Amino acid sequence: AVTRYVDNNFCGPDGYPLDCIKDFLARAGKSMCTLSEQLDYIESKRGVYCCRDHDHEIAWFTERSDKSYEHQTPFEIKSAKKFDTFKGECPKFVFPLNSKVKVIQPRVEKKKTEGFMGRIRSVYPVASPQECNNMHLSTLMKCNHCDEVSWQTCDFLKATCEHCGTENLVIEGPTTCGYLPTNAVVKMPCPACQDPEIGPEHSVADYHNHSNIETRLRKGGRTRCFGGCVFAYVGCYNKRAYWVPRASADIGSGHTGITGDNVETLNEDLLEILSR
Ligand SMILES: [Zn+2]
Ligand SMILES: [Zn+2]
Ligand SMILES: [Zn+2]
Numbered sequence: 001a002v003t004r005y006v007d008n009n010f011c012g013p014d015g016y017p018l019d020c021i022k023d024f025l026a027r028a029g030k031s032m033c034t035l036s037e038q039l040d041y042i043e044s045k046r047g048v049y050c051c052r053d054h055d056h057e058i059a060w061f062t063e064r065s066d067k068s069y070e071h072q073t074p075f076e077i078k079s080a081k082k083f084d085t086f087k088g089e090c091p092k093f094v095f096p097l098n099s100k101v102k103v104i105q106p107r108v109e110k111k112k113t114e115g116f117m118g119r120i121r122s123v124y125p126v127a128s129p130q131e132c133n134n135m136h137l138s139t140l141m142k143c144n145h146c147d148e149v150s151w152q153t154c155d156f157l158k159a160t161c162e163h164c165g166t167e168n169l170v171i172e173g174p175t176t177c178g179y180l181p182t183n184a185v186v187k188m189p190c191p192a193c194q195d196p197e198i199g200p201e202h203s204v205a206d207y208h209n210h211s212n213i214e215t216r217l218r219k220g221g222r223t224r225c226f227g228g229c230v231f232a233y234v235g236c237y238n239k240r241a242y243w244v245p246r247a248s249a250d251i252g253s254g255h256t257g258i259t260g261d262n263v264e265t266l267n268e269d270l271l272e273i274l275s276r
Contacts, residue, residue, distance in 0.1 A: 005091050007060040008083060009035060010042060014225070015074025015094040016218070020051050022070050034066045058083045059090055060097075074230055075103045075247050082264065090264045096228045096257025097267055099249035102180075116242075119235035123244050124183040129237045133181030135245070137227055140174040140266070155188050156213050156226060156243075174260035176270075177227035177245065179253070186231060186243040188213075193239035200239060207233060207241060228256040 002020075003012045010021045024045075025031050025038050033041075048056040063078040080095045095101055104123055112118050120126055138151045143161035145168075152159035152168065159168050177186075192202045192210040208215060208222065215222035215233075224231045229245035236242065251257035251267065253274040258267040 002054045004055065004057055005059040006048075006056050007062040007064075007080075008058050009039060009062055009064045009072065010056070010069065011062070011064070011072050013059075013091060013093050014216075015072075015077055015230075017069050017072050018056075020054070024050055025069055031070060032068055035064060035069055035072065036066055038069045057086070057088075059086050059088070060093055074101075074225075077101045077247075080249070089262060092261045092263075093259060094225055094230065095247075095249040096251050096259050097264060098271075099228070099251045099257055101247055101249050104244060104246050116235045116237040120237075120242065123234060126183050129242075132183045132185045132242065134187050135181060135184055136178035137186065138176050138178065139170055139227075140260075141168065141171055143168055155186065156224065156231075157188070172260070174258050174263045174266055175227035176258050177229045177248070177256040179255050180245070180248050180250065184245055184248070185234075186245075187240045188243070190236045190239055190241040193236050193241075200236060202236075204233070204235075207236070211241065225259075228259045 003018050005013055010018065012018050028041060030038050030041055042050050048058060060080055061083045062080045064072060065076040067076055074094045077095060079100050080093065081098045082090055090097065107122050107125065109118065109121050113121055126132060137154050139154050139159055140149060140151050141159065142149045143164060143166055145166035146161060146164040148163045150162055152161050154170050157170055159170050161168060192198045192206045193200045198206055213224060215224050228249045230247040231243045232246045234242045234244050248256055252271050255274055258270055
């Protein structure tokens with residue numbers, strides 16, 4: 001399918017390169033040029049009309065690294081906002097508008113710790129699992145029992161309605177990851193760990209085969225986007241799976257903001273209640 005909306009760097013709403021633009025650059029001499037050079041070429045070839053048989057439209061301004069287009073990812077975004085001359089309604093984007101993006105830098109233990117602590121210490125300089133702080137995720141969504149649309153605290157799979165107490169399956173809608181804590185994690189009960197025929201010594205493949213949490217596979221990594229963050233699975237401890245926001249955004253006050261379709265006003269309005 002044609003990806004119409006892009007950032008000013010010609011990357012899509014998920015933060016990744018479009019196959020059509022990648023091929024367009026490759027057909028010219030330019031797949032290994034810098035992003036700046038590639039964008040100069042695209043601007044010289046009618047910008048959003050460069051593909052000829054379909055149109056693009058710039059919805060976002062992003063600051064990115066200068067890596068070649070084919071190597072651009074959401075982890076190469078430094079900041080994101082609405083494009084100054086885009087006057088339409090912003091579609092869903094991987095990061096909230098008017099935000100700065102932080103990427104977790106991998107750590108190397110001088111002395112590899114075994115088990116879960118070695119896995120988490122490749123992410124955070126923590127001495128114990130309890131130094132990790134669980135995030136508070138929420139989604140603005142309808143409750144099937146009381147029909148109200150409200151902010152339901154959730155994990156990746158289940159949300160709870162604050163009006164009536166009903167658990168609801170998480171569906172697409174405005175999402176936030178709350179404030180970004182130090183040593184940020186999202187903890188969920190691990191089905192593989194709970195199954196006696198599999199159990200806590202399971203593999204990473206075992207985790208994803210039984211979690212029921214869909215991921216995107218790309219260049220050997222698996223991620224799930226939610227609420228302005230890009231999450232990856234780290235490992236399990238005491239039968240809970242730990243995910244970390246390998247990328248997170250900050251709209252102000254350390255808050256991850258709101259992502260989703262038609263959330264521009266919501267995300268702006270949220271900033272106002274973070275301070276006085
Ligand atoms: Zn195209
Ligand atoms: Zn309800
Ligand atoms: Zn597990």
